[PDB]
């Protein structure tokens, strides 16, 4: 893919949290930071299933992977 995925993902990330922390840090707990909770992923997925048409689960995935941006940036890259 292009950098529009790594960027968009991050962009859609910092946007999700509504803060400017993940935009930099590549290991800023999206859960331990309170930035995210769960409902966020749902949305992110919506955008992750449009620009990336990802097929990530939700029922009960490895939040650990959806806890950080990197772990995600990798999940998005390992989905395309």
Q: What tokens were used for 49?
A: 């299933």
DSSP annotation of 47: H
Sketch out the chain's domains with CATH numbers.
1-80 (1.10.1200.10)
Whole-angstrom CA distances from 57 to 19, 23, 27, 30, 45 are: 25, 24, 21, 17, 9
Rounded CA gap, 35 and 37, in Å? 7
Q: Are 79 and 55 in contact (CB under 8 A)?
A: yes
Q: Are 37 and 43 in contact (CB under 8 A)?
A: no
* Residue where the block lists tokens 């960027």: 7
**Structure-determination technique:** NMR
CB atoms within 10 A of CB 9: 23
CB atoms within 10 A of CB 27: 10
Q: What angle do CA 24, 54, 80 make, to 5 degrees?
A: 80
């Amino acid at each position: 893919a292009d950098e529009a995925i790594k960027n968009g993902v991050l962009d859609i990330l910092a946007d999700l949290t509504g803060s400017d922390d993940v935009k930099k840090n590549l290991d800023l707990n999206l859960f331990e930071t309170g930035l995210l909770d769960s409902m966020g992923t749902v949305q992110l997925l919506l955008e992750l299933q449009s620009q990336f048409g990802v097929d990530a689960p939700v029922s009960e995935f490895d939040r650990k992977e959806w806890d950080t941006p990197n772990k995600i940036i990798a999940k998005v890259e390992q989905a395309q």
